Short mmCIF file of C-alpha atoms and ligand atoms in Angstrom, two decimals:
data_model
loop_
_atom_site.label_atom_id
_atom_site.label_comp_id
_atom_site.label_asym_id
_atom_site.label_seq_id
_atom_site.Cartn_x
_atom_site.Cartn_y
_atom_site.Cartn_z
CA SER A 29 2.65 1.78 -1.77
CA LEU A 30 4.75 2.08 -4.93
CA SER A 31 8.39 3.04 -5.07
CA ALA A 32 9.17 6.29 -6.85
CA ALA A 33 10.23 4.37 -9.96
CA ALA A 34 7.01 2.36 -10.20
CA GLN A 35 5.02 5.53 -9.55
CA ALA A 36 6.92 7.18 -12.43
CA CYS A 37 5.87 4.37 -14.79
CA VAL A 38 2.25 4.74 -13.72
CA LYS A 39 2.46 8.49 -14.30
CA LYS A 40 4.07 8.01 -17.70
CA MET A 41 1.39 5.48 -18.67
CA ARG A 42 -1.46 7.67 -17.43
CA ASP A 43 -0.10 10.65 -19.35
CA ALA A 44 0.08 8.51 -22.47
CA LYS A 45 -3.52 7.41 -21.88
CA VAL A 46 -2.58 3.79 -21.36
CA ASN A 47 -5.53 1.60 -20.46
CA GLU A 48 -5.93 1.15 -16.67
CA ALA A 49 -5.98 -2.65 -16.89
CA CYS A 50 -2.65 -2.62 -18.69
CA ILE A 51 -1.18 -0.32 -16.05
CA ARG A 52 -2.40 -2.46 -13.16
CA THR A 53 -0.97 -5.53 -14.91
CA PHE A 54 2.37 -3.92 -15.75
CA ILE A 55 2.76 -2.49 -12.25
CA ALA A 56 2.24 -5.85 -10.52
CA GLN A 57 5.01 -7.13 -12.77
CA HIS A 58 7.21 -4.13 -11.84
CA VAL A 59 6.63 -4.93 -8.16
CA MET A 60 7.88 -8.47 -8.79
CA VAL A 61 10.98 -7.34 -10.66
CA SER A 62 11.88 -4.77 -7.97
CA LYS A 63 11.82 -7.66 -5.48
CA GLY A 64 14.31 -9.80 -7.39
CA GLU A 65 12.03 -11.76 -9.73
CA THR A 66 14.08 -12.46 -12.89
CA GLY A 67 11.41 -14.58 -14.54
CA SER A 68 13.58 -17.69 -14.54
CA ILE A 69 12.10 -21.09 -13.69
CA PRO A 70 14.89 -23.43 -12.54
CA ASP A 71 14.97 -27.11 -13.44
CA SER A 72 14.86 -28.03 -9.74
CA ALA A 73 11.48 -26.33 -9.47
CA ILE A 74 9.67 -28.33 -12.16
CA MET A 75 8.99 -31.90 -13.32
CA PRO A 76 8.10 -33.61 -16.64
CA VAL A 77 4.54 -34.38 -17.75
CA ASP A 78 4.12 -38.09 -18.47
CA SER A 79 0.48 -38.46 -19.28
CA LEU A 80 -1.94 -36.44 -21.39
CA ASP A 81 -5.06 -37.37 -23.36
CA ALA A 82 -4.55 -37.32 -27.11
CA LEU A 83 -6.70 -35.52 -29.65
CA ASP A 84 -6.34 -38.65 -31.86
CA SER A 85 -8.47 -40.63 -29.41
CA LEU A 86 -11.36 -38.18 -29.64
CA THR A 87 -14.26 -38.63 -32.06
CA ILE A 88 -17.31 -36.74 -30.83
CA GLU A 89 -17.92 -33.28 -32.30
CA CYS A 90 -19.52 -30.41 -30.38
CA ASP A 91 -23.14 -29.36 -31.01
CA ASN A 92 -24.06 -26.40 -33.21
CA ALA A 93 -24.65 -24.13 -30.22
CA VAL A 94 -21.13 -24.59 -28.83
CA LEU A 95 -19.53 -24.15 -32.22
CA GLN A 96 -21.47 -20.96 -32.83
CA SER A 97 -20.19 -19.57 -29.53
CA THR A 98 -16.55 -19.91 -30.61
CA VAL A 99 -14.36 -16.97 -31.61
CA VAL A 100 -11.17 -17.38 -33.68
CA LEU A 101 -8.19 -15.13 -33.05
CA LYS A 102 -4.81 -14.99 -34.77
CA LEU A 103 -1.87 -13.26 -33.03
CA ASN A 104 -0.32 -10.71 -35.37
CA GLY A 105 1.52 -8.03 -33.40
CA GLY A 106 5.08 -9.23 -33.07
CA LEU A 107 8.31 -8.21 -34.76
CA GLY A 108 10.35 -10.64 -36.77
CA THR A 109 13.52 -8.90 -35.63
CA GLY A 110 15.39 -12.22 -35.60
CA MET A 111 14.57 -12.73 -39.29
CA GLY A 112 15.43 -9.13 -40.16
CA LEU A 113 11.79 -8.27 -40.80
CA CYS A 114 10.41 -4.77 -40.39
CA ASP A 115 6.68 -5.41 -40.84
CA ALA A 116 4.06 -8.10 -40.23
CA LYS A 117 5.51 -11.56 -40.71
CA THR A 118 2.13 -12.72 -42.00
CA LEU A 119 2.60 -10.60 -45.13
CA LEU A 120 5.43 -12.86 -46.32
CA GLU A 121 4.74 -15.40 -49.05
CA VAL A 122 4.25 -19.05 -48.02
CA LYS A 123 3.33 -20.59 -51.39
CA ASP A 124 3.47 -18.97 -54.84
CA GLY A 125 1.39 -15.79 -54.61
CA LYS A 126 -0.05 -16.55 -51.16
CA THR A 127 0.93 -15.00 -47.83
CA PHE A 128 0.21 -16.24 -44.31
CA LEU A 129 -2.58 -13.66 -44.29
CA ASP A 130 -3.93 -15.11 -47.53
CA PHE A 131 -4.26 -18.62 -46.10
CA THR A 132 -5.66 -17.32 -42.82
CA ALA A 133 -8.53 -15.56 -44.61
CA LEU A 134 -9.15 -18.55 -46.86
CA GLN A 135 -9.39 -20.58 -43.66
CA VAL A 136 -11.95 -18.21 -42.18
CA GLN A 137 -13.90 -18.15 -45.46
CA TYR A 138 -13.95 -21.93 -45.68
CA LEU A 139 -15.38 -22.23 -42.18
CA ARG A 140 -17.97 -19.53 -42.87
CA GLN A 141 -19.13 -21.45 -45.94
CA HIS A 142 -19.20 -24.78 -44.15
CA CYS A 143 -19.26 -24.67 -40.33
CA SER A 144 -20.75 -21.35 -39.18
CA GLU A 145 -21.49 -18.53 -41.60
CA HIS A 146 -21.07 -15.88 -38.89
CA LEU A 147 -17.80 -17.18 -37.44
CA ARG A 148 -16.14 -14.39 -35.47
CA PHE A 149 -12.54 -13.94 -36.60
CA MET A 150 -10.02 -11.63 -34.95
CA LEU A 151 -6.39 -10.49 -35.27
CA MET A 152 -4.36 -8.94 -32.47
CA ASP A 153 -2.20 -6.24 -34.05
CA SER A 154 0.51 -3.88 -32.77
CA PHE A 155 0.66 -0.37 -34.20
CA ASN A 156 3.63 -1.58 -36.16
CA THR A 157 1.55 -4.25 -37.96
CA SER A 158 -1.93 -2.66 -37.95
CA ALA A 159 -1.87 -0.46 -41.05
CA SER A 160 -0.13 -3.03 -43.26
CA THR A 161 -2.60 -5.72 -42.26
CA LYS A 162 -5.65 -3.53 -42.80
CA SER A 163 -4.53 -2.37 -46.24
CA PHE A 164 -3.79 -5.95 -47.30
CA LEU A 165 -7.32 -7.09 -46.37
CA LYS A 166 -8.84 -3.99 -48.00
CA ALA A 167 -7.26 -4.85 -51.33
CA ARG A 168 -7.63 -8.65 -51.09
CA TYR A 169 -10.47 -9.59 -48.68
CA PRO A 170 -12.92 -6.63 -48.48
CA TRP A 171 -15.50 -8.68 -46.56
CA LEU A 172 -12.98 -8.69 -43.67
CA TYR A 173 -11.89 -5.09 -44.19
CA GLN A 174 -15.45 -3.73 -43.85
CA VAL A 175 -15.66 -5.01 -40.27
CA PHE A 176 -11.97 -4.63 -39.42
CA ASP A 177 -12.47 -1.93 -36.81
CA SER A 178 -15.79 -3.20 -35.54
CA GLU A 179 -15.04 -6.84 -34.93
CA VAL A 180 -11.70 -8.07 -36.19
CA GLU A 181 -8.88 -6.02 -34.74
CA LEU A 182 -7.71 -6.23 -31.17
CA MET A 183 -4.93 -3.69 -30.63
CA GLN A 184 -2.28 -4.84 -28.17
CA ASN A 185 -0.99 -2.50 -25.47
CA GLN A 186 2.36 -0.75 -25.23
CA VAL A 187 4.41 -0.66 -22.02
CA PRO A 188 7.44 1.40 -21.03
CA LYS A 189 10.95 -0.04 -21.20
CA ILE A 190 12.55 0.46 -17.77
CA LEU A 191 16.14 1.28 -16.81
CA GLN A 192 17.90 -1.82 -15.49
CA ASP A 193 19.23 -0.07 -12.39
CA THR A 194 16.44 2.00 -10.90
CA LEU A 195 13.53 0.48 -12.83
CA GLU A 196 12.53 4.01 -13.86
CA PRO A 197 10.95 4.42 -17.27
CA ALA A 198 13.67 5.02 -19.85
CA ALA A 199 13.81 8.15 -22.01
CA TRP A 200 15.24 8.35 -25.53
CA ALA A 201 15.39 11.95 -26.79
CA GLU A 202 16.42 10.90 -30.29
CA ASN A 203 13.29 8.79 -30.83
CA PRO A 204 10.87 8.70 -27.89
CA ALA A 205 8.78 6.01 -29.62
CA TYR A 206 11.67 3.70 -28.58
CA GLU A 207 10.60 4.22 -24.93
CA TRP A 208 7.72 1.77 -25.48
CA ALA A 209 7.67 -1.95 -26.23
CA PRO A 210 5.05 -4.63 -26.88
CA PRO A 211 4.27 -6.64 -23.72
CA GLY A 212 4.34 -10.13 -25.23
CA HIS A 213 1.35 -12.10 -26.58
CA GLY A 214 0.34 -12.74 -22.96
CA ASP A 215 -1.02 -9.20 -23.33
CA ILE A 216 -4.04 -10.58 -25.20
CA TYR A 217 -5.96 -11.19 -21.95
CA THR A 218 -5.19 -7.71 -20.70
CA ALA A 219 -6.14 -6.00 -23.99
CA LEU A 220 -9.29 -8.09 -24.34
CA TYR A 221 -10.28 -7.13 -20.82
CA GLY A 222 -9.27 -3.48 -20.78
CA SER A 223 -10.82 -2.52 -24.08
CA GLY A 224 -14.12 -3.98 -22.93
CA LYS A 225 -14.06 -6.47 -25.78
CA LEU A 226 -13.90 -9.51 -23.50
CA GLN A 227 -17.06 -8.37 -21.73
CA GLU A 228 -18.73 -7.56 -25.05
CA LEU A 229 -18.07 -11.01 -26.53
CA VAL A 230 -19.45 -12.68 -23.45
CA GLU A 231 -22.56 -10.43 -23.57
CA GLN A 232 -23.13 -11.42 -27.19
CA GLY A 233 -23.06 -15.11 -26.28
CA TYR A 234 -19.51 -16.15 -27.19
CA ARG A 235 -18.20 -18.82 -24.85
CA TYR A 236 -14.92 -20.05 -26.35
CA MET A 237 -11.95 -18.60 -28.10
CA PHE A 238 -9.42 -20.49 -30.18
CA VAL A 239 -6.12 -18.62 -30.40
CA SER A 240 -2.99 -19.55 -32.37
CA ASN A 241 0.17 -17.85 -33.69
CA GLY A 242 0.02 -15.89 -36.90
CA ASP A 243 2.91 -17.99 -38.31
CA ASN A 244 1.27 -21.36 -37.70
CA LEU A 245 -1.08 -22.24 -40.57
CA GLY A 246 -1.73 -25.81 -39.45
CA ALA A 247 -4.06 -24.57 -36.73
CA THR A 248 -7.83 -24.24 -37.13
CA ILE A 249 -10.82 -25.18 -35.01
CA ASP A 250 -11.44 -28.82 -34.28
CA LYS A 251 -14.98 -29.48 -33.05
CA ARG A 252 -13.75 -32.49 -31.10
CA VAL A 253 -11.70 -30.23 -28.80
CA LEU A 254 -14.82 -28.22 -27.99
CA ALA A 255 -16.88 -31.34 -27.16
CA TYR A 256 -14.04 -32.61 -24.97
CA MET A 257 -13.84 -29.26 -23.20
CA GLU A 258 -17.61 -29.13 -22.70
CA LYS A 259 -17.64 -32.60 -21.22
CA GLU A 260 -14.47 -32.59 -19.17
CA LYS A 261 -15.49 -29.10 -18.10
CA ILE A 262 -12.09 -27.62 -18.95
CA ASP A 263 -11.75 -23.86 -18.95
CA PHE A 264 -8.35 -23.63 -20.63
CA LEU A 265 -6.69 -26.07 -22.99
CA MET A 266 -3.19 -26.00 -24.41
CA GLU A 267 -2.38 -28.03 -27.50
CA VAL A 268 1.10 -29.58 -27.19
CA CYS A 269 3.09 -31.61 -29.73
CA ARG A 270 5.66 -34.39 -29.17
CA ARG A 271 8.90 -32.40 -29.27
CA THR A 272 11.12 -32.84 -32.30
CA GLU A 273 14.69 -31.74 -33.05
CA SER A 274 13.32 -28.61 -34.82
CA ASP A 275 11.57 -27.32 -31.68
CA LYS A 276 14.21 -25.02 -30.20
CA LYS A 277 12.43 -21.65 -30.08
CA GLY A 278 9.24 -21.64 -28.04
CA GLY A 279 8.18 -23.20 -24.75
CA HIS A 280 7.57 -26.59 -23.23
CA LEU A 281 5.01 -27.96 -20.80
CA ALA A 282 5.87 -28.99 -17.24
CA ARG A 283 4.27 -29.73 -13.90
CA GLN A 284 4.66 -29.06 -10.20
CA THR A 285 2.81 -30.86 -7.41
CA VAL A 286 0.43 -29.09 -5.09
CA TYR A 287 -0.93 -30.65 -1.89
CA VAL A 288 -4.63 -30.24 -1.22
CA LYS A 289 -5.19 -31.78 2.20
CA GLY A 290 -8.92 -31.77 1.64
CA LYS A 291 -11.31 -33.46 4.05
CA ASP A 292 -11.43 -35.27 7.36
CA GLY A 293 -10.13 -38.83 7.36
CA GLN A 294 -8.96 -38.70 3.74
CA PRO A 295 -5.21 -38.10 3.45
CA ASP A 296 -2.80 -35.97 1.41
CA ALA A 297 -4.37 -35.57 -2.01
CA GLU A 298 -1.72 -34.73 -4.60
CA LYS A 299 -2.67 -32.29 -7.33
CA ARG A 300 -0.67 -31.83 -10.51
CA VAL A 301 -0.53 -28.23 -11.75
CA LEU A 302 0.79 -27.45 -15.23
CA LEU A 303 2.87 -24.50 -16.35
CA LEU A 304 4.73 -23.16 -19.37
CA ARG A 305 8.46 -22.46 -19.55
CA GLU A 306 9.59 -20.33 -22.47
CA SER A 307 13.18 -20.53 -23.60
CA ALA A 308 13.68 -17.07 -22.03
CA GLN A 309 12.53 -18.47 -18.67
CA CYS A 310 15.28 -21.06 -18.46
CA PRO A 311 18.29 -19.84 -16.48
CA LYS A 312 20.79 -18.91 -19.19
CA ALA A 313 23.42 -21.26 -17.76
CA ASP A 314 21.09 -24.30 -17.66
CA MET A 315 19.86 -24.10 -21.22
CA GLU A 316 20.92 -27.64 -22.14
CA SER A 317 18.16 -28.98 -19.89
CA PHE A 318 15.58 -26.84 -21.75
CA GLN A 319 17.14 -28.17 -24.97
CA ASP A 320 16.85 -31.84 -24.02
CA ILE A 321 13.81 -32.97 -25.99
CA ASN A 322 13.59 -36.19 -24.00
CA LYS A 323 13.33 -34.63 -20.55
CA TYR A 324 10.62 -32.22 -21.76
CA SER A 325 8.97 -33.78 -24.77
CA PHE A 326 5.78 -31.73 -24.76
CA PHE A 327 6.24 -28.54 -26.76
CA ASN A 328 3.63 -25.80 -26.74
CA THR A 329 2.10 -25.11 -30.16
CA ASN A 330 0.40 -21.99 -28.76
CA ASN A 331 -2.86 -23.40 -30.11
CA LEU A 332 -4.94 -22.38 -27.11
CA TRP A 333 -8.60 -22.66 -26.21
CA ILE A 334 -10.14 -20.49 -23.52
CA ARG A 335 -13.62 -20.35 -22.04
CA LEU A 336 -14.39 -16.64 -22.14
CA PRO A 337 -16.87 -16.28 -19.26
CA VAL A 338 -14.40 -17.96 -16.91
CA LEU A 339 -11.49 -15.86 -18.08
CA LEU A 340 -13.56 -12.74 -17.59
CA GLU A 341 -14.66 -13.72 -14.09
CA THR A 342 -11.25 -14.79 -12.80
CA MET A 343 -9.75 -11.52 -14.08
CA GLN A 344 -12.56 -9.60 -12.39
CA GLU A 345 -11.92 -11.34 -9.07
CA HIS A 346 -8.25 -10.63 -9.39
CA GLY A 347 -8.32 -6.85 -9.62
CA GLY A 348 -9.00 -6.83 -13.34
CA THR A 349 -5.80 -8.57 -14.44
CA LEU A 350 -4.43 -12.02 -15.10
CA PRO A 351 -1.31 -12.42 -12.96
CA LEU A 352 0.81 -14.24 -15.55
CA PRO A 353 4.44 -14.96 -14.56
CA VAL A 354 6.63 -12.06 -15.70
CA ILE A 355 9.38 -12.53 -18.26
CA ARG A 356 12.24 -10.04 -17.83
CA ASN A 357 13.66 -9.34 -21.26
CA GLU A 358 16.98 -7.43 -21.36
CA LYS A 359 17.74 -5.03 -24.22
CA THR A 360 18.83 -1.44 -24.84
CA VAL A 361 16.30 1.39 -25.40
CA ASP A 362 17.49 1.58 -28.99
CA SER A 363 17.81 -2.12 -29.87
CA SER A 364 20.20 -1.17 -32.70
CA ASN A 365 22.50 1.04 -30.65
CA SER A 366 24.41 -0.77 -27.89
CA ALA A 367 25.62 2.52 -26.47
CA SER A 368 22.03 3.33 -25.51
CA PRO A 369 20.96 2.58 -21.91
CA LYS A 370 20.22 -0.99 -20.81
CA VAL A 371 16.59 -1.74 -20.08
CA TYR A 372 14.19 -4.45 -19.00
CA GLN A 373 11.09 -5.06 -21.13
CA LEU A 374 8.48 -6.91 -19.12
CA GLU A 375 6.45 -9.45 -21.07
CA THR A 376 4.25 -12.47 -20.60
CA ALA A 377 3.44 -15.44 -22.79
CA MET A 378 -0.18 -16.36 -23.61
CA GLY A 379 0.33 -20.01 -22.70
CA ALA A 380 1.38 -19.19 -19.14
CA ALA A 381 -2.35 -18.87 -18.42
CA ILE A 382 -2.46 -22.68 -18.15
CA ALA A 383 -1.43 -22.16 -14.53
CA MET A 384 -4.32 -19.83 -13.81
CA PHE A 385 -7.38 -22.03 -13.89
CA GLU A 386 -8.17 -24.93 -11.59
CA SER A 387 -9.43 -26.99 -14.55
CA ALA A 388 -6.73 -26.06 -17.04
CA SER A 389 -5.17 -28.88 -19.04
CA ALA A 390 -3.15 -29.80 -22.12
CA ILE A 391 -3.78 -32.28 -24.91
CA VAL A 392 -1.29 -33.94 -27.23
CA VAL A 393 -2.17 -33.15 -30.87
CA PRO A 394 -0.71 -34.52 -34.12
CA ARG A 395 2.06 -32.52 -35.82
CA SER A 396 -0.35 -31.46 -38.60
CA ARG A 397 -1.75 -28.78 -36.26
CA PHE A 398 1.73 -27.22 -35.87
CA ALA A 399 3.75 -25.80 -38.81
CA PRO A 400 5.86 -23.08 -37.08
CA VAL A 401 7.85 -20.31 -38.75
CA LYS A 402 10.26 -18.73 -36.23
CA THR A 403 13.34 -18.56 -38.49
CA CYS A 404 14.17 -18.40 -42.19
CA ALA A 405 15.16 -22.06 -41.79
CA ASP A 406 11.54 -22.85 -40.88
CA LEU A 407 10.37 -20.65 -43.74
CA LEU A 408 12.42 -22.74 -46.16
CA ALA A 409 10.69 -25.89 -44.93
CA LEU A 410 7.24 -24.31 -45.20
CA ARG A 411 7.97 -23.12 -48.73
CA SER A 412 9.39 -26.44 -49.97
CA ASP A 413 7.15 -29.26 -51.16
CA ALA A 414 7.60 -30.74 -47.69
CA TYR A 415 4.41 -28.84 -46.72
CA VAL A 416 1.11 -29.17 -48.57
CA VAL A 417 -2.17 -27.23 -48.74
CA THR A 418 -5.34 -28.97 -47.59
CA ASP A 419 -8.88 -28.31 -48.77
CA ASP A 420 -9.76 -26.25 -45.67
CA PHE A 421 -6.54 -24.33 -46.46
CA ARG A 422 -4.17 -25.43 -43.72
CA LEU A 423 -0.48 -26.02 -44.37
CA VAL A 424 0.45 -29.52 -43.27
CA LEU A 425 3.50 -31.70 -43.58
CA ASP A 426 3.40 -34.16 -46.49
CA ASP A 427 2.21 -37.67 -45.54
CA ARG A 428 5.61 -39.06 -46.54
CA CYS A 429 7.23 -37.12 -43.68
CA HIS A 430 5.46 -39.08 -40.92
CA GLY A 431 5.00 -36.02 -38.71
CA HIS A 432 8.72 -35.38 -39.11
CA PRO A 433 9.56 -31.99 -40.59
CA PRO A 434 12.93 -31.63 -42.39
CA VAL A 435 15.70 -30.60 -40.01
CA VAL A 436 16.95 -27.43 -41.67
CA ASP A 437 20.11 -25.63 -40.60
CA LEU A 438 21.24 -22.50 -42.41
CA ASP A 439 24.46 -20.61 -41.81
CA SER A 440 23.43 -17.75 -39.50
CA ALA A 441 25.96 -15.48 -41.25
CA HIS A 442 24.20 -15.61 -44.62
CA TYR A 443 20.63 -16.72 -44.05
CA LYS A 444 19.43 -15.56 -40.62
CA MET A 445 18.14 -12.33 -42.23
CA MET A 446 15.30 -12.43 -44.77
CA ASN A 447 17.47 -10.62 -47.34
CA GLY A 448 20.08 -13.35 -47.06
CA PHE A 449 17.60 -16.23 -47.11
CA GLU A 450 15.78 -14.67 -50.06
CA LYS A 451 18.89 -14.88 -52.25
CA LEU A 452 19.35 -18.54 -51.25
CA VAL A 453 16.08 -19.51 -52.97
CA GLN A 454 16.30 -16.79 -55.60
CA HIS A 455 16.40 -19.45 -58.33
CA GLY A 456 13.92 -21.87 -56.83
CA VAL A 457 12.96 -23.73 -53.66
CA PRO A 458 14.54 -27.22 -53.41
CA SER A 459 12.25 -30.23 -52.97
CA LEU A 460 12.67 -31.29 -49.33
CA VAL A 461 9.78 -33.70 -48.91
CA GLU A 462 12.18 -36.69 -49.08
CA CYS A 463 14.85 -34.79 -47.18
CA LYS A 464 15.39 -35.57 -43.50
CA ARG A 465 18.16 -33.07 -42.85
CA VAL A 466 19.69 -30.28 -44.87
CA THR A 467 22.48 -28.05 -43.68
CA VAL A 468 24.00 -25.14 -45.59
CA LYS A 469 27.39 -23.78 -44.63
CA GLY A 470 28.91 -20.70 -46.22
CA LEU A 471 27.39 -18.73 -49.08
CA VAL A 472 25.31 -20.87 -51.40
CA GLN A 473 22.53 -20.51 -53.92
CA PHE A 474 19.99 -23.16 -54.92
CA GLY A 475 19.45 -23.73 -58.61
CA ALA A 476 16.16 -24.80 -60.18
CA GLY A 477 14.68 -28.28 -59.74
CA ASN A 478 17.05 -29.02 -56.84
CA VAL A 479 15.88 -32.28 -55.17
CA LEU A 480 17.31 -33.32 -51.81
CA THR A 481 16.92 -36.76 -50.23
CA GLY A 482 18.16 -38.28 -46.99
CA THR A 483 20.79 -36.31 -45.08
CA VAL A 484 22.27 -33.52 -47.24
CA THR A 485 24.93 -30.94 -46.35
CA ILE A 486 26.07 -28.20 -48.68
CA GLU A 487 29.45 -26.68 -47.88
CA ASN A 488 30.96 -23.51 -49.27
CA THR A 489 34.32 -23.60 -47.50
CA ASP A 490 35.57 -21.29 -50.26
CA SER A 491 33.68 -18.23 -48.92
CA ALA A 492 34.45 -15.32 -51.26
CA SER A 493 32.43 -16.93 -54.08
CA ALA A 494 28.79 -18.04 -54.08
CA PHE A 495 28.69 -21.79 -54.75
CA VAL A 496 25.74 -21.94 -57.17
CA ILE A 497 24.19 -25.38 -57.32
CA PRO A 498 23.35 -26.54 -60.89
CA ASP A 499 19.78 -26.80 -62.14
CA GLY A 500 17.93 -30.10 -61.89
CA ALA A 501 20.59 -31.18 -59.40
CA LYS A 502 19.84 -34.21 -57.22
CA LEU A 503 21.50 -34.59 -53.84
CA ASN A 504 21.11 -37.80 -51.84
CA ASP A 505 22.92 -38.54 -48.55
CA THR A 506 25.90 -36.40 -49.57
CA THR A 507 27.97 -33.29 -48.77
CA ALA A 508 28.05 -31.17 -51.93
CA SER A 509 30.65 -28.44 -52.22
CA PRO A 510 32.77 -26.70 -54.89
O1 UPG B 11 3.83 -8.79 -28.11
C1 UPG B 11 3.62 -9.62 -28.98
C2 UPG B 11 4.56 -10.72 -29.30
C3 UPG B 11 4.19 -11.66 -30.21
N1 UPG B 11 2.95 -11.62 -30.89
C4 UPG B 11 2.57 -12.66 -31.89
O2 UPG B 11 2.28 -13.88 -31.17
C5 UPG B 11 3.00 -14.98 -31.78
C6 UPG B 11 4.24 -15.19 -30.85
O3 UPG B 11 5.18 -16.00 -31.37
P1 UPG B 11 6.71 -15.77 -31.58
O4 UPG B 11 7.29 -14.60 -30.94
O5 UPG B 11 6.96 -16.03 -33.00
O6 UPG B 11 7.10 -16.98 -30.70
P2 UPG B 11 7.35 -17.25 -29.15
O7 UPG B 11 6.74 -16.25 -28.31
O8 UPG B 11 8.81 -17.40 -29.01
O9 UPG B 11 6.61 -18.63 -28.77
C7 UPG B 11 5.23 -18.98 -28.84
O10 UPG B 11 4.99 -19.97 -29.86
C8 UPG B 11 5.76 -21.21 -29.66
C9 UPG B 11 5.25 -22.14 -30.74
O11 UPG B 11 5.81 -21.58 -31.93
C10 UPG B 11 5.45 -21.83 -28.27
O12 UPG B 11 6.29 -22.99 -28.12
C11 UPG B 11 5.73 -20.81 -27.16
O13 UPG B 11 5.41 -21.36 -25.87
C12 UPG B 11 4.88 -19.54 -27.46
O14 UPG B 11 5.10 -18.54 -26.48
C13 UPG B 11 3.28 -14.47 -33.19
O15 UPG B 11 2.13 -14.66 -34.07
C14 UPG B 11 3.57 -12.98 -33.02
O16 UPG B 11 3.47 -12.15 -34.16
C15 UPG B 11 2.05 -10.53 -30.68
O17 UPG B 11 0.98 -10.46 -31.27
N2 UPG B 11 2.47 -9.61 -29.75
#
């Protein structure tokens, strides 16, 4: 029996024609929250993972059948609020004249010309990113546009922001659209299930799905992963990378120990269960432990593989939902206005599913399968010569980097927003391939042919005047300033 508040959310969602699966999923989360669940996973409750197989040790590729039964999906429904974006992040340029969307399509095309001509490709969009994405494909990749509605787009759900006190759905007279928020990428399972698409794919013979973030262009299908999954009989596989200094926004792997006292005579059998802990799930006042890349050295790339029939059946047996651990995000109904009421926005992360299948597992993969873009600082790295384009169109770190991406640090006051960062490279993107660390303090502007090497800091202590770096400049292990 639901409290009045929960019942009000259900009513609001029904009135707005929200899919039943999404409502059941959101409500179970609301029940948790009402009982005290904050979403936090304390350090005392988890332990490090010390042993995982490595993709580098694999060699056998899957058979044609298995490959043909694999669907590719790219997440594309988030906001780049932190980077001051207002539309799909994937529409931003990555290399001269090419956007994330450009390289994604080229990737699909390449696989359709080489691996499987009928490769099923999908994009999960939000209503905020849907139209922009469709129009881009229509003008640039018509072969994708023509089947956009039929097979490519998965529309994520929308859930109501709830008042922090009573947990009642919040109202915003000025702009009611602000009463709804995306539910996190963890919503993919729910949307796949509720729309009937998950069932449809399984009916058509699809058995696996390879999902990855829209910002990560180093991720494509590796037939060795499929063979490994087939053999080891794994239903869910998370690709994790050895954590570097640059991995601060995202989640890390961890384990807990479960005791399965199975059998007569045989004793306490210990069973390691894995789980994901997003930055937002670390108690705010214990963040340094989440930040210690030695304690938790396995960082989630969000390159996930899921066996569709199994996902479908476990959701069916569980009331038609995937009970992922809730993440309680705090904000105000009108993100911009801090005078607006405080609210909780319940979300889930796609990788949290690793805790939902008995045979779930993780695999360490090389850094080439992970080129993240969470900040403008990451965008700088991706744009610089540090990253290169492969033949199958993935963006990978240059060989000279040794799996070590440049540690970029830009003054949050001038470059956190895309408008600020865009003026920083207005005159050209500095070569960073031979650069291990570059920091920029104060207002600065790169000139053309700028080449950094070793550890380079650029200080503009002056402030009131943009320190414009000369053209052809060359900065090696130094601190350049006016
Ligand atoms: O409701 C949502 C929210 C996000 N996204 C998309 O899904 C990806 C989510 O990534 P983003 O918000 O940029 O990053 P995080 O959620 O902070 O982190 C994810 O990606 C990190 C690797 O970059 C992992 O370490 C984390 O565990 C994983 O949750 C992006 O393509 C988004 O556009 C959606 O489609 N819908």
